[PDB]
From Swiss-Prot:
Protein species of origin: Homo sapiens
Cellular compartments annotated: Cytoplasm; Nucleus
Residues bearing the modification Phosphoserine: S176, S178
Effect recorded for S178A: Increased constitutive activity
Domain commentary: The MH1 domain is required for DNA binding. Also binds zinc ions which are necessary for the DNA binding.
Protein name as annotated: Mothers against decapentaplegic homolog 3
Residues recorded as bearing N6-acetyllysine in the entry: K145
Length: 178
């Protein structure tokens, strides 16, 4: 996939900034006021007229944030911030729980071997069963405070394009012969 994922930033229930499209296998999402580029999604420059003290307080603790890694269809997250990050990944929980990644730690947030196995099995269950897997292609992550997700001050939503494109391909193959 051209862009392995798209990342959208949120402040409580408010969408902030444009969607980040990841083209590099490794990149960071941090709270710095630097311009974003292919290797970093910087949340510090983003403005929000309706931003309260709670959100601005959290934003100051993001720091180095999180480094995301894409390899072999798998996705890993590493907490660079000195405050923890919290991930809600259906695929990860498949082994709605929120995982806490403390400072300096790492976790595989998307297992493509697990996904492939669930996909092969889901085909036998029908179109709807395969489509249900789209839910594992969306991962939410919050900075500093864990958790609805709209109740956390700073969070991002990732959409994994590789798995989604694969699901599209399979669903297409399931076209009824009639």
């Amino acid at each position: 996939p051209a862009f392995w994922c798209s990342i959208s930033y949120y402040e409580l229930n408010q969408r902030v900034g444009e969607t980040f499209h990841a083209s590099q296998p490794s990149m960071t999402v941090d709270g710095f006021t630097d311009p974003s580029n292919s290797e970093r999604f910087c949340l510090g420059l983003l403005s929000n007229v309706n931003r309260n003290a709670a959100v601005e307080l959290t934003r100051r603790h993001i720091g180095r944030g999180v480094r995301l890694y894409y390899i072999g269809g798998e996705v890993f997250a590493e907490c660079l911030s000195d405050s923890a990050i919290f991930v809600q990944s259906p695929n990860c929980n498949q082994r709605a729980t929120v995982c806490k990644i403390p400072p300096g730690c790492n976790l595989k947030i998307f297992n493509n071997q697990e996904f492939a196995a669930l996909l092969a099995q889901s085909v036998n269950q029908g179109f709807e069963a395969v489509y249900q897997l789209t839910r594992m292609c969306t991962i939410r992550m919050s900075f500093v405070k864990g958790w609805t997700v709209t109740s956390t001050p700073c969070w991002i939503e990732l959409h994994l394009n590789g798995p989604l494109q694969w699901l599209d391909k399979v669903l297409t193959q399931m076209g009824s012969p009639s």
